[PDB]
Amino acid sequence: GINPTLFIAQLINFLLLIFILRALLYRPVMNLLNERTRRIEESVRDAEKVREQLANARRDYEAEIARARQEAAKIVAQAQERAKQQEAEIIAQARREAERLKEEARAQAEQERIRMLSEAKSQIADLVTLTASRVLGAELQARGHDALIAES
Amino acid sequence: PTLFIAQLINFLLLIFILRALLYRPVMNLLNERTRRIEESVRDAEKVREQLANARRDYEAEIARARQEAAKIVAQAQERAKQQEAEIIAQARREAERLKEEARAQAEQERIRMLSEAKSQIADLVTLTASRVLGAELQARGHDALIAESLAAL
Amino acid sequence: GINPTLFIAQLINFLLLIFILRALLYRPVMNLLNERTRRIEESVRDAEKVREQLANARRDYEAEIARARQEAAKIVAQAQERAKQQEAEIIAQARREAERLKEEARAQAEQERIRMLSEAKSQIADLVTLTASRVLGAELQARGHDALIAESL
Amino acid sequence: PTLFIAQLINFLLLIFILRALLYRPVMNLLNERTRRIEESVRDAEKVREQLANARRDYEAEIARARQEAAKIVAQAQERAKQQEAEIIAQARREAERLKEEARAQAEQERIRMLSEAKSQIADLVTLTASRVLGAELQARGHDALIAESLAAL
Amino acid sequence: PITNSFVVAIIIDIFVIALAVAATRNLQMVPRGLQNVMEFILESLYNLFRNINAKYVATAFPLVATIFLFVLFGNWFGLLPGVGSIGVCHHDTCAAQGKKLVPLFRAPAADLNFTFAIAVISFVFIEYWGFRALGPGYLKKFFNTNGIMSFVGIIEFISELVKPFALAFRLFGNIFAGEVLLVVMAFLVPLLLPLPFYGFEVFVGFIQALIFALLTYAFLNIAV
Amino acid sequence: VGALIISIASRFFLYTGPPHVEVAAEVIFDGIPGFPITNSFVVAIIIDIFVIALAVAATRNLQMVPRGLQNVMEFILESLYNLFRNINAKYVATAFPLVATIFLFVLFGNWFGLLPGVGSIGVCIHDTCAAQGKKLVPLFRAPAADLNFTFAIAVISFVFIEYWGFRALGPGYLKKFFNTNGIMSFVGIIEFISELVKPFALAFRLFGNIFAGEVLLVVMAFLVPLLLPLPFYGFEVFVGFIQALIFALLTYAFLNIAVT
Amino acid sequence: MEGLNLVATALAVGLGAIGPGVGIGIIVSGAVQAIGRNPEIENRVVTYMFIGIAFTEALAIFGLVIAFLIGF
Amino acid sequence: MEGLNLVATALAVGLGAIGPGVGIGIIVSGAVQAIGRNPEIENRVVTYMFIGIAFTEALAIFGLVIAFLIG
Amino acid sequence: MEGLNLVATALAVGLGAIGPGVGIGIIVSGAVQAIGRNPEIENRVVTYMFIGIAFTEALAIFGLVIAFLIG
Amino acid sequence: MEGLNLVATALAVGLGAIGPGVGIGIIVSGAVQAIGRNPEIENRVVTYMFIGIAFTEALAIFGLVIAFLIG
Amino acid sequence: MEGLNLVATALAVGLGAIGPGVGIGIIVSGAVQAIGRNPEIENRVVTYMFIGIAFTEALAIFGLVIAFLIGF
Amino acid sequence: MEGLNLVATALAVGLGAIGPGVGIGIIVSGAVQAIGRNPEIENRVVTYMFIGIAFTEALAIFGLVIAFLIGFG
Amino acid sequence: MEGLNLVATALAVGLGAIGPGVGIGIIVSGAVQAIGRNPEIENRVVTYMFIGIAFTEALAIFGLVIAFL
Amino acid sequence: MEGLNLVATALAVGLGAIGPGVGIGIIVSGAVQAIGRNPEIENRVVTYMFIGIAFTEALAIFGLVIAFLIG
Amino acid sequence: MEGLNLVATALAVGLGAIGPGVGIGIIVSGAVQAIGRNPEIENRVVTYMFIGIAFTEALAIFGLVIAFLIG
Amino acid sequence: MEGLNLVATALAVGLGAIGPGVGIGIIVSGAVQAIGRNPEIENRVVTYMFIGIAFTEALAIFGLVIAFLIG
């Protein structure tokens, strides 16, 4: 109970359905494959973004470190220049003082010695006090001796 | 026939009755699978957004680094001002100490010269007195020491 | 062949054989097995008891030796106590003898003091001769003084 | 019929085959069981004999230890008596030594008292001679011959 | 003209192109609707096709995948009750004045050619690939290869030839199994008796389509 | 020796000389008023006497040292005593000789079956008694072939099972009786039916086994003169020894079953 | 013959259920063994547990139905 | 062949009782072998155990009912 | 013929005892290995053995009733 | 029918013996294998062996009694 | 004799399928225990699980087809 | 049907023992399997070995003896 | 009579099929155990399983073709 | 009905051979499996190898001899 | 009978096919499981497997040629 | 009826060969299982393998010659 004509008709219908289905679904299979495979490019982009963020963080840290180093170097240079100028000024002032004050002290000592040497009235008063001091006192000398005054 | 219709109706009813109860969990599973595929798509979109905004994140990091640089420069300026002020103050203090020491040394030199002059004047007065003591003794007579020597006995 | 009489006869024969075996075969075999098991158990128990008996004999010998030693030590201690008492009695007798010796020494001292009374008989004349001996050339007489000798001390 | 003859021939052949192989192993197994039973019986007999001899030896050792303890106790009593005698003898010897020492010390004390009394009498005689002769030489013995004696040269 | 079974050969065949067109219209990431759960099994079948061989996933996939996809609905098509309960006429509905009551509302896969149509398409394409890949090696006699070991190639090639014939027959028998089982509970009971295994048979028919797809994968596996 | 195996002497009155079958289900000696004598039952008394004679010899001159039959019977009895103790020592000594009496009689019965020449032995090809006009009443029928004797033993075993059943939960045997609910009721009823069948089974078990060796020996004799039966007889002798051991073992197993 | 259809009807029905009756007997036997070891892959292995049962039970219906083609 | 129905009647009754009768034997043997293994998933797989028993017992039903159709 | 009913009596009883005669053998063998492994779940698991025969023994008695009906 | 009952009697006994005869092979061999694995458990596991045997042995005897009844 | 094909048309289907109705159960349950240790290996196993089943069920087909080649 | 009883007496003798003809080998195997693993229980398990041997063989004798009712009345 | 050939047709088909109907099932399941053991020798043994299939399945079709003759 | 004895001969020939003809391999397989278990013990293991063979080889010849009687 | 030889033709072809149809399956799968466990001694096994195959394949051809002569 | 001997020819040739023929596989499968673990005992068990073959094939070729003896 098998009809070759009916068998041929059924085979033709099945073959036409299969060919049409293959032609229609060749595109859909590739579409689904691309939709699934987009995640691979997504992961590649995510890895690239992570690498870029890490590079940006490293660059920011390096910039902060370099800025801190330059700031410290500038502060150190300014402090060193200020200290050098201060030390030079202090040394110059100390030298000027030790020179001028000492020279003026020596000159004033010499002048005061000369004036006191000129101020022999106290030395004359000293000789007057020395007169009759337990000698030429109760028994005074014969008219004294002006030579000591002459010596003075 | 009537029996065939009844059998077909009962089979369809049983099929639907089983299908609803089975499809409840099956609809849950299908919704879970759709949600998983949508979550994969959302992860793809988030990765793309992160890749796009990497430039903005780098700009923000560069801005933070520039702000840190400005803060470091301000701290350097403040430290330089403080160190310069400390150096100037120390220099002024040392100069004042040196000037006070110089003035004190000058005054002490004046005092020492005065004291040395006083001692030298005392010595010279004794010498000048001795220079005329012999002449005074010769003029007034030396028998007083002989009288003094006798008074010693 | 479903004859019941033959079945009954066979059953009777089997029952009689079983009774005979219980009387003859089963009883002697059970007796022999029980005797063998009892002999084995008795041998094990006897070995354990023999080891225990040897250990107990050694322990008893040691204990008898210890008891004898304890009794001997008690006898020795009693003898030592008696000897100590005798030695104390001897020491007391020695102390009494020493006291008697001291008393005899005191009596001898008293006898010596009594003999010192003979000095009046002798030492008076001994001194009188000694005074003559003291007088070089034997002056004595007028040069001597018997009253001073009579004065004595 | 010949069936019985054939059956007998087959039975004889089977018996010969069985005796060829099974007889040796069955005999070996029976001999092994008999040997095990005999070994167990000999072990039980030896254990019983050992237990009996051990009880006998324990009694004998108890008797020997009792005899040794009795000998020890007798030796203890004899040593106690001997030590009591020795202690009494040592005490008597020490007492005799003390008594002899007392007698010797008494003789020494008598001699010492005699010597001490002699020395005291001599000192008294010397003192009395000094008193009397000095009194005698003062006036009674006062003669110029004293200077002549001093002038011996 | 042709038989009612050959007439029924386009009831699902038209929908087969329509479903693939719907599959072409509905195929995207996270597709909800026509491509939600069926494509997941299809991808698993593609994974199963990948589990067979990477080449087998595309060597004759157009010659294989559509038929299994069609028979998946075709298995569901057979499970439909009441189709033919009244005679179509080419005291029952058509018992009186019988016009042979040829019902076109019947499973065309029940025809052995319809099973053989998918079977021959996969078998020949595998054989053509087998001709391309092995050819003579597919039926390599290997005369006295290992001391008269030539029977390996001859028997297997006959068995392999029998296998494509059996595969068409087995699917036809499986198709006939459901058709026979359709009236099994019909005269037995008037209600709900066929439901005990009709869905299971449909699942088995769905498995049979998968088995045919597996056989297509297996034939490629044999071709590999 | 070597390849001297010929054994071609079979063709000597092997087929024409021996009868075709000449077998029977049972043989009765009869010739006695009241109870009819049976050649199997007569052999059983002879078997019982020989077993008693074996028992008498070991019992006579009994000594502590095991030797000869005393040593042989000991290890024979001890293993069975050990086996029963290994099986179930709760009531092993309760009926230890009873199983042994079953064991020894069957072992004697197997030995009785091993006795040759009983076939042609019989009073009235043609043979002698069959050649004679009177019916060839065969002599020395197999005592073990008496299925009634096995049935009597099985009934006694069933009685022994019943006596154990009388001990099994006392007179209760409730699990053996029935169960109230659950599947245990159907199984227990089946088991009780199975237990009842089990006594009848053992009797049928040994009876066919006993009859088999006699059938096999006759069959072998009708087939071959002497060669095949000798290999065949040893198998039956081992089988008879096994079945004898198996017989009381099943009773012990029934006792072990009744122990539960 | 008069009952030759009837014995043929009892032929396929009685016969066909045997092997498939054993076949399902085999399947679930080792299945519970597999599920008993791993209760978690139950959902994975019960899936393949019944696909054979789908085959195996169906085979017994073949001669069952064919004998019903002799039943009436 | 007047009793041809009768021999037909008892034909399938004993036949179909064999394989499923074996089949229940196989399943419960494997089931019980795993029930002692897994008393935990027991209550889950006791239901699994009776799944094939229902399948096999239904097969034994088919032979008996058609016998009553003939008997 | 005549013994067609009589041979029918032989059929189901003769056939039916086989599969259960195997199937009962299968379970207890598998049970004992499970029982030997787990004698603690034994009471819980031999219940399945006790109900396992009930799934099968009832099948074996299908022809026995019918045989007596033909009896 | 010229000894049809003779044929009929000679079937069921030969039929219902192979199955149970197999079933004995299953249980005890599986039991001994378990007992070989587990010498410890021997009290109720061995009992489970014999209760199935009694269930198994009875199956082979169903038609054997009925054989001589028709016989 | 009369209608001799009646038993014949029911013969092979009852016989020729039960053995195949067993081997699949062996195929399945053996695989079930095999896959019961590795579930994900089904990709290589389930594909080989059905190739024999295809051969096995093909034997079951033979009883069905000749039941009408002789049946008609 | 001149050979019908001859057929009948040859019916159950072929059958019946097949299962025991197989089951004994199973009984042999697993026991032999068991003693290979467990040689120490051999003094106790070989007892269990012959338990089913009697069970198998006893049913196997039925095909012989009962068929002799057919062969010999 | 008049159907013995028709009887003979279903004879070998129903009989011989179960051999491979079981034997191949043992082979395949045994192969699955072997594949479950290792798929490394799968190239050798799946072919060797097919070798046994060629050994077995060929026997199964012996009576099928003969019955048509 | 000629040849009815000739077929009657072949009855026990085929059936009586397959049963024992299977168990022997099981005896062989069980032994050879245990040979690999422990070749250490061979005198008291392979002893059991031929124990079942006598229960098996001789069992088959039961129908062999009675069939020749028909012959 | 007119088809008795025709029936006799179909017996042995159907009959003997099961043995090698199963025994070789046992030969193959037993070896396949063995070879699958270890293919090292496979070449020895395959030769010994072919030894078993040859001991069984020839049995399948015993009545195969014989039937064609009668045919 | 002019062909029962021809039928009986296929009986003894067919039947009695499946069992032993399968039993060869049991020997073979059991061997390769043991062969799969030990080649040194192999030469000791090649004879033991030949023990089974001699036990198997001898019974196998019983009815083959017997069929010609009565054919």
UniProtKB/Swiss-Prot annotation, chain C:
The gene is atpF. Keywords: ATP synthesis, Cell membrane, CF(0), Hydrogen ion transport, Ion transport, Membrane, Transmembrane, Transmembrane helix, Transport. This is ATP synthase subunit b. It is found in: Cell membrane. GO terms for cellular component: plasma membrane; proton-transporting ATP synthase complex. Belongs to the ATPase B chain family. SUPFAM superfamilies: F1F0 ATP synthase subunit B, membrane domain. Its main location: membrane. The chain crosses the membrane at residues 1-20. GO terms for molecular function: proton-transporting ATP synthase activity, rotational mechanism.
Curated annotation (Swiss-Prot), chains G, K:
The chain crosses the membrane at residues 7-27, 50-70. F-type ATPases have 2 components, F(1) - the catalytic core - and F(0) - the membrane proton channel. F(1) has five subunits: alpha(3), beta(3), gamma(1), delta(1), epsilon(1). F(0) has four main subunits: a(1), b(1), b'(1) and c(10-14). The alpha and beta chains form an alternating ring which encloses part of the gamma chain. F(1) is attached to F(0) by a central stalk formed by the gamma and epsilon chains, while a peripheral stalk is formed by the delta, b and b' chains. This is ATP synthase subunit c. It is a multi-pass membrane protein. The keyword Transmembrane helix applies. F(1)F(0) ATP synthase produces ATP from ADP in the presence of a proton or sodium gradient. F-type ATPases consist of two structural domains, F(1) containing the extramembraneous catalytic core and F(0) containing the membrane proton channel, linked together by a central stalk and a peripheral stalk. During catalysis, ATP synthesis in the catalytic domain of F(1) is coupled via a rotary mechanism of the central stalk subunits to proton translocation. It comes from Chloroflexus aurantiacus (strain ATCC 29366 / DSM 635 / J-10-fl). InterPro entries: ATP_synth_csu_bac/chlpt, ATP_synth_F0_csu, ATP_synth_F0_csu_DDCD_BS, ATP_synth_F0_csu_sf, ATPase_proteolipid_c-like_dom, F/V-ATP_Csub_sf. Keywords: ATP synthesis, Cell membrane, CF(0), Hydrogen ion transport, Ion transport, Lipid-binding, Membrane, Transmembrane, Transmembrane helix, Transport. HAMAP family: ATP_synth_c_bact (MF_01396). The gene is atpE. GO terms for molecular function: lipid binding; proton-transporting ATP synthase activity, rotational mechanism. Coiled coil: none annotated. It holds the Pfam family ATP-synt_C. One of its GO terms (cellular component) is proton-transporting two-sector ATPase complex, proton-transporting domain. The record marks 57 as: Reversibly protonated during proton transport.
